[PDB]
Amino acid sequence: MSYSYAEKKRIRKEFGVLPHILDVPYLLSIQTESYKKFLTVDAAKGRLHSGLEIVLKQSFPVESKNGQYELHYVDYQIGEPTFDETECQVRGATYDAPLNVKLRLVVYNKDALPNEKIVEDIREEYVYMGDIPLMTTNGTFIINGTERVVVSQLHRSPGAFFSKDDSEEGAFSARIIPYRGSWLDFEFDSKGIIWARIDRKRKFCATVILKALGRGRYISDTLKYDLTRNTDEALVEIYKVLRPGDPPAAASVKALFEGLFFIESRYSLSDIGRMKLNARLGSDKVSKDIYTLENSDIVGVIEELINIRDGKGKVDDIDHLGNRRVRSVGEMVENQFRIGLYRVEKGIRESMSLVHKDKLMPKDIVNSKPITAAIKEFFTSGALSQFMDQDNPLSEVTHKRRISALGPGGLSRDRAGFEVRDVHATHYGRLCPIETPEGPNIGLINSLASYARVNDYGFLEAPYRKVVDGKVTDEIEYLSAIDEDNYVIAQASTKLDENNHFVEDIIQCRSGGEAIFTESSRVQYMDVSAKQMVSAAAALIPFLEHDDANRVLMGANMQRQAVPTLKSEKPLVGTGMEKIVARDSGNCIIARNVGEVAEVDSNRIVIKVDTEKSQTSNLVDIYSLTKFKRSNKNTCINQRPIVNVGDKVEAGDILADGFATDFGELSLGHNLMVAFMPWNGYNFEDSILLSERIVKDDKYTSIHIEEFTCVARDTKLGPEEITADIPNVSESSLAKLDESGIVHIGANVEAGDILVAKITPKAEQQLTPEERLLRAIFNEKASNVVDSSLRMPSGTSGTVINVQVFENDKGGKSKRALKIEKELIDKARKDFDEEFAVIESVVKSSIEQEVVGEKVQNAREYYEEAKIAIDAKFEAKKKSITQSNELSPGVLKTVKVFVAIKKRIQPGDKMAGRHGNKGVVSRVLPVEDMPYMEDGTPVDVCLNPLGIPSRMNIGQILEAHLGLASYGLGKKIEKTLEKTRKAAELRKTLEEVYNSVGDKKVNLEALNDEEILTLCDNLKGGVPIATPVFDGAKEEDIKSLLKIGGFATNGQMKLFDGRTGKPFDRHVTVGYMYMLKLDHLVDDKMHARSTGSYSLVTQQPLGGKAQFGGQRFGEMEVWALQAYGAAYTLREMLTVKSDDIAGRSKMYKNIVDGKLTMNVDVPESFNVLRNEVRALGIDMDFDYSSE
């Protein structure tokens, strides 16, 4: 029942009785969808006008100053990007698209009101506007050769919000929020007086605003309190409040008051605030299209506030999802573009002031400098923008879906506590509550749920199924958060009689958004899926319901930190969410059209597509694999093809898995037999014990790639040389170094070995007389140059997979450098030309097959089109400035070195289970020592039972029993296939193994005998089982599976100690306990330091291990030392150890000498503090007191 090539190769058992009403929506849709609306217009969507085009149209007309010049926008043209994303990243250039717009200017006599501009400037031209960054189909941005992801931002929606502080009774408040600009506020008072403020200022009556414009007793109390006599007086008072100590002006105040709230550019609602305000007052008379504030709107807001004080109405909830909206990265890009456009418009108005030309074209006035800088500044320095995590494919999906309220317009980390961190009732359908940072940012990540979707207004919506006449309809609809509160929704778990009618009279459902017991008749909707509430990352964990929420959150955060192994192993127990996660992430290749593989090699895939069952196409497509691609986490990424020659394939099938993917399924862990008994105190707490077979079998070995860059710069004294000709260096050390001075590719480098050699000149050596005598005795000259070669840090071992060199610009290349560059270009073009010919040769063979079928004009230009791309590829390599980059002026040359070193799990490493149980390996034991079953198979890992009782992670025990059942099922299949390997009996054995339990009915009959033999070989290690997160198989089904395996109906089994061979009293549960390794190696954490460089300002040691590191001494540690009374330890550590320059040298000499002496005259930091005080008028000095 696999129905797919990936499914056909291995068949995974499935569980649960819930039908799949709707398939999961695309995970990356939210990131991809926002960019398209900004850069594209769809008639069906109704997005006729692109946002960028609308922004250009709004500010295009200027009419500077009666110059007979008119600026009109005609059209926008987008230039093709110079380099593809793969080429841009290798070069380090940022993927970008040129933006061009058409401006028409009309000129004429420019007389006083006659024929000013109707007879001139009939000529118009396209003017370059700037460079716009482009988004890949994966929705990621490459900047400076670095991939980046912009997190979505959640911000309070523009509108009118009424809230009352409880400090005083009747203290209601009215707030109006604009999309941009200042927002006015109204505050009630204990006396019942009304006050109006703008953002911040002196308190004043709200009546002043009405005076400027032109059962209620509140107006009477407020009117008498204010002494304002006329609107002019009120306007002068408002101007004085806005600026203090500034004289009022007759026309100055009028322009300022209208400008603050009556300027369209200055103040706009964005069409969201106006829509909310009209709905809140329910008035259609005010124009919805105009986003500017109106006198009627302000009077209505004041009326609503008075009505709330009367007691008719309800206060709004800020925490409510409907009030909060999510802002896409493209909207931020649009805002930056608008700011740049405003600056450009101001420049154009100023630019017209100087004219020195005849029939001047409208190209000189346009300036593109302002727009490019703002967008680049936002992308490079954007707080929301950050490097995407490369640890695993799941991590990349988690980061893109993440929405952060933090950033501009966002609450500060310490500002908001105990309010936004909680989960609202509306959060169930929009944001998964089990996933959040355990750090202070906890409760702000608000990771988006898998089924969560974004409406055009930016409000998240959740799919639901309507119910008619007590009968559930199959129609699926999306409900807004505000709409959802009124309706009552029943959970999908509720059973049906097959007529879509609820059997139970009383069911648990949310009518007010809070779970309650209600009759089936009142229910109006049903949940589309059980896992809809949980996030996509949460669904991966099996037996989620059995696990505690805190432990589940800890496990979910830990799984994303998992590090990929050399061989991917599919988990025996899986929710089945892994296959969707792998397909959605672009780490695997999917065939565009149905075709039969023509040639397969581990560098590219060639496929031929049949036109009869497919739309018209070239008939040949080529897919290029990526081998050992470097990652931000320094994790090797490579793609291996699962396709075979002459293998039928269909669109959407995975030709080959790429990163952390096995057979189209994401695997971050290896299955190991696990026992649950305390051993010798090796795991007293969270410690984990490893048999060592995994270390020997390379079960947990990972490959890390390290890039080292050496650059050459021109100093004032001289230009530094990377040539490997350094005095005082032996030939054997330089023997690995090539004649060019760059280490040979593929050559193992010991720690501290020279990767590149550089010499920098020195002057005014001023050698001391003893040094002079030494030079005279040996006739030794003093070098005027010093060597600063690049060497790998100690404790690091690797081989050089790739070497990159960039030459100088504007300088003719040397024969070795110039010849090397030409040779590299020819090899890339020559390999491409032969490779391009190979594709051309395959097309020619296909034509020969179709020679009877007419190819004379059918593919005449097909070869020509391929030739143009090859020429462009040759041009692109020579299209560079000659250094492959600008290089930054003052940089002579740069070199890039890539080293890949394998890593194997060792003691002190950290392993975290999917259930959230985590441990650090304490020791490695011999295979004989590890406990074994009566069969004698060893137990790879032993776990502590006490920890499971303390934390309710009951899911892990159930998974271990399920894993044991899967292990038992595999052994029976191995016994059946060990002898008499015939398809007919194997089919019966497979029917018993899969159809014995469950209603899945895999229908293995469809698979041919040849497929059956491969499937049996694949299942030898284990039989895959898929469990729904809330639809997991019950204990009875697992017990039946254990019986089929022939194991007793319990997890525990008899075991014998290896050392004495005597069985332990009491049986011990054995489970697969699938495990993953977190990215926390102990190799980089050792941080051993004895003597290190000191901070220049404080003469104190550097920290963090960046250079020599060292451990800072805490103030609390000083308190503990004072409690101990060890003054000698405290005094010595503070002076000689840290800032005593005289003491440190003396201490080092004494330690080398071995003689005992102590000098602690003073600490340098105290002297620096006295100097800082001395600069101020206050004077601090040491003194002697005889009094």
Partner: peptide, 18 residues
């Protein structure tokens, strides 16, 4: 006027513009 405004530019301009 003498509003106690801290900024010098506002104070200087008022005298200069008289």
């Amino acid at each position: 006027l003498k509003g106690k405004t801290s900024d010098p530019i506002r104070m200087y301009m008022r005298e200069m513009g008289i």
